[PDB]
Amino acid sequence: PLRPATVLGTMEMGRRMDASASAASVRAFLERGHSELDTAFMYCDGQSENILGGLGLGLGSGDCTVKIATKANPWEGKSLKPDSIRSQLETSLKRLQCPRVDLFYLHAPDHSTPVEETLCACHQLHQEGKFVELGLSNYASWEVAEICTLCKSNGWILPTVYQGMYNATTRQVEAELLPCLRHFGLRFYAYNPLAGGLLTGKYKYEDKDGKQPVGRFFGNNWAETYRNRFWKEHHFEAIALVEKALQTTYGTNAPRMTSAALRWMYHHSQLQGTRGDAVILGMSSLEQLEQNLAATEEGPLEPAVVEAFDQAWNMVAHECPNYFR
Numbered sequence: 001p002l003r004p005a006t007v008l009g010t011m012e013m014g015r016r017m018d019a020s021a022s023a024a025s026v027r028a029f030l031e032r033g034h035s036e037l038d039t040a041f042m043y044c045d046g047q048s049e050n051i052l053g054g055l056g057l058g059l060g061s062g063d064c065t066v067k068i069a070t071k072a073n074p075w076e077g078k079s080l081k082p083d084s085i086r087s088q089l090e091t092s093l094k095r096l097q098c099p100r101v102d103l104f105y106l107h108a109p110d111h112s113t114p115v116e117e118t119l120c121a122c123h124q125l126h127q128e129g130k131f132v133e134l135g136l137s138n139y140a141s142w143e144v145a146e147i148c149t150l151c152k153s154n155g156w157i158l159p160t161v162y163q164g165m166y167n168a169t170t171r172q173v174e175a176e177l178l179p180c181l182r183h184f185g186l187r188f189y190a191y192n193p194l195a196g197g198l199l200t201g202k203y204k205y206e207d208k209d210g211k212q213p214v215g216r217f218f219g220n221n222w223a224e225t226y227r228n229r230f231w232k233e234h235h236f237e238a239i240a241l242v243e244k245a246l247q248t249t250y251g252t253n254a255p256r257m258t259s260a261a262l263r264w265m266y267h268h269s270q271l272q273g274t275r276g277d278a279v280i281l282g283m284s285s286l287e288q289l290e291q292n293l294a295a296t297e298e299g300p301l302e303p304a305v306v307e308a309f310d311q312a313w314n315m316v317a318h319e320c321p322n323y324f325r
């Protein structure tokens, strides 16, 4: 088929990446012919949205090539109650300097708020023109099915996108979530395509006790969460397996682990570009992004390497982190 689409992740805009690095990145991304951006109310205390709103992209003014997604979250007391959802979205619109977003997600479940309450509110906001499509992230397949079923019966807008954790060594979503989304007509966007950077091969397990190199896995408030998600001895072993396969198969022409990992996504995963499925790229620099953008344009990997990626998943599958929260 056509390959999956490519979406630009903006989680680092306002933390490691300033307005100028951010602009450069978006420019680089658009030059490759891509068009969707992914942000959230949460990112950098609103700076990711603020940065994007100032880039003069005319977001949400249909007459408009660039598509924006944002998300409302229940954290730090906010809940996904109707007033909370509305406030988050209205704040996001202000920061993005736009009258409506193309895609609005529920960022993660609020297990203390009945989902019908949240959905009804989403439907109202859509009726007001504040977003085009609804999405879900970090809900379990069964929770997705409940939501779609409830929307159908109540005349609410159905979610059409699911944003989920997926990479060569993180495949829990395959068994149940994907079949569920296919049944109910949702496309799937993959986050953590490089396992937060673990799939670059840049780390060694014992970095956790020693170097503690500043980044995704050290120094910030989600770091421990990231380490619990991915920083496992079998995951390192699994990566080494793949690196060895890349050397044996390609020799001096071997692609970098980063570029192998991304190529897995675009060529060897269960993402289907004909369904509108996509990979959300991540970066904390322009230079990382350019590398990643180049990888997305490379071709399939050799069979021996694809096999090694399967072996690598088989090693970590028993301790795979939950795509759902």
Ligand SMILES: NC(=O)c1ccc[n+]([C@@H]2O[C@H](COP(=O)([O-])OP(=O)(O)OC[C@H]3O[C@@H](n4cnc5c(N)ncnc54)[C@H](OP(=O)(O)O)[C@@H]3O)[C@@H](O)[C@H]2O)c1
Binding pocket: 008, 009, 010, 011, 012, 038, 039, 107, 137, 138, 163, 164, 190, 191, 192, 193, 194, 195, 196, 197, 198, 200, 202, 214, 215, 216, 217, 258, 280, 281, 282, 283, 284, 285, 287, 288, 289, 291, 292
């Ligand atoms: N829905 C959700 O709950 C959710 C969750 C996560 C992400 N997302 C979205 O998806 C986007 C991407 O996910 P992600 O950031 O987790 O993707 P990722 O590609 O798995 O992680 C990206 C991180 O890996 C490192 N990296 C990327 N390219 C590199 C390269 N070429 N060389 C060396 N290191 C490299 C950088 O980390 P360091 O430089 O910091 O080491 C970068 O911040 C986000 O920006 C956000 O929009 C959504």
